[PDB]
Amino acid sequence: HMAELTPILPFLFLGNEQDAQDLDTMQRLNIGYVINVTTHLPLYHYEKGLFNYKRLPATDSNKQNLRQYFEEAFEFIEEAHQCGKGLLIHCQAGVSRSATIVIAYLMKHTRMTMTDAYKFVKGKRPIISPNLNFMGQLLEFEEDLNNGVT
Numbered sequence: 001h002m003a004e005l006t007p008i009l010p011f012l013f014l015g016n017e018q019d020a021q022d023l024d025t026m027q028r029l030n031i032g033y034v035i036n037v038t039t040h041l042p043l044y045h046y047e048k049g050l051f052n053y054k055r056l057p058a059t060d061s062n063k064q065n066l067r068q069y070f071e072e073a074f075e076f077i078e079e080a081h082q083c084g085k086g087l088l089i090h091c092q093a094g095v096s097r098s099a100t101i102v103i104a105y106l107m108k109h110t111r112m113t114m115t116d117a118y119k120f121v122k123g124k125r126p127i128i129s130p131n132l133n134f135m136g137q138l139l140e141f142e143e144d145l146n147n148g149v150t
């Protein structure tokens, strides 16, 4: 597999589970942190002691709450940021879970509207599968940011 570790920001990369298995590319991009946004995929390289792994144990379903993990993900992204290392956030094909988290990060920490952040991510990673539940959670999150509640 030819991994596509999509650079959203200089240190923030988006990919699927085949991308997350490409050890050589991950090391070449100075990635030091991995967020696995799934309940069931391996921490593929855990036993090599190369990356700081975090699991956000979410399914790609119409009932899954991802909003509950946003702040945890943001803190870990800021750790990689301040450490000068890259972070890969991934789930499965179509990246619905990991792209939602990236979009939320852009909204809160780079002052983007939800629509602009979605279009920004889709401009770099053209295939993003729909999850209407996650769309609604981004919309509630946008409303909360605009009301100063988060």
Ligand SMILES: CC(C)(C)C(=O)CSc1ncc2c(n1)-c1cccnc1CC2
Pocket (backbone or CB within 6 Å): 095, 096, 097, 099, 100, 103, 114, 115, 118, 128, 129, 130, 131, 132, 134, 135, 138
């Ligand atoms: C939530 C997630 C990122 C997994 C997706 O569902 C991607 S697919 C898709 N399809 C149609 C729309 C949107 N996303 C969408 C998302 C955010 C803001 N505005 C839109 C406009 C309609």
